[PDB]
Amino acid sequence: LTPSPSLPADFAVCEGDDIALSTSTVASSYDWSGPNGFTSNAQNPVVITNATGSNAGVYTLSIVDGNGCSSADTSVQVTVNAAPTQPSMTTNSPICNGADLVMSTSAVGNSYIWRAPNGADTTTASSTLTIAPTSSLYQSGNWTLSVVNAAGCVSPASVASMVTINNGTNP
């Protein structure tokens, strides 16, 4: 009798990540089925990319062995962890060069990602970021926020805030 095929332990992925299922066994044929009509006949089904809530559920696999007999069914549960909604960023925009630049949000999560106009990326535990005039982050331009939740899921970036750092004079 063909012992059942071997599947991975239960999965959890972040929304937007990829769900890759596979089996470690050997068969004449494989037969997979699941949520959102996922069917395949491979020992490595096409990966479900950009997975969402509709891809969560129970995936089932059975095989036909070399003797021509079907195995018992086995299954793996896969879930998808939702990301936070788009966060809102508030700044202290008209800042005079030399004054501290402060940015903050009202969004919650385990950490916040503050993306500088030139791609520099600083992560804080706090909802409020202070940038010194001597930092590589003390730059003008369009700043955005992304928020990380308990599952490690990252929210869509916020609408950029335009930061202006002004120069005064020396009369």
Add this chain to the structure above:
Amino acid sequence: LTPSPSLPADFAVCEGDDIALSTSTVASSYDWSGPNGFTSNAQNPVVITNATGSNAGVYTLSIVDGNGCSSADTSVQVTVNAAPTQPSMTTNSPICNGADLVMSTSAVGNSYIWRAPNGADTTTASSTLTIAPTSSLYQSGNWTLSVVNAAGCVSPASVASMVTINNGTNP
């Protein structure tokens, strides 16, 4: 008995490169299978272009010979080396014509690629580039950085930095 088909030695490609598998043998039919449900019946399967992490894994080939008999299976392992994340470029922008132009990053890798606005391309081992006023690279416009890691993988280019070279006067 049909000896197994001959495959290439294990592969490694950079992410974004192409994975081209083939066999050197002769068969009535070929049967390939692999990661991300790659199946084919050729002695030269369609090349997987723009390969990514999901294309890494073990590719398996078996054939049917001229006598009508199946060969034993053989396989090749193929991996994919990830590129660094988008690097951040910082310049010394308002430079007075005749002063040295300096560009730098915080990104790491074996080498850095500094791409001039007109396409000139200089590679440095250092994270900091100095351009003399007498160099063909002493030019204004939008400059970008790409970073090369240990595997030879090249990161996505940085957000361009606008470099301004100003002219003073002669009163």
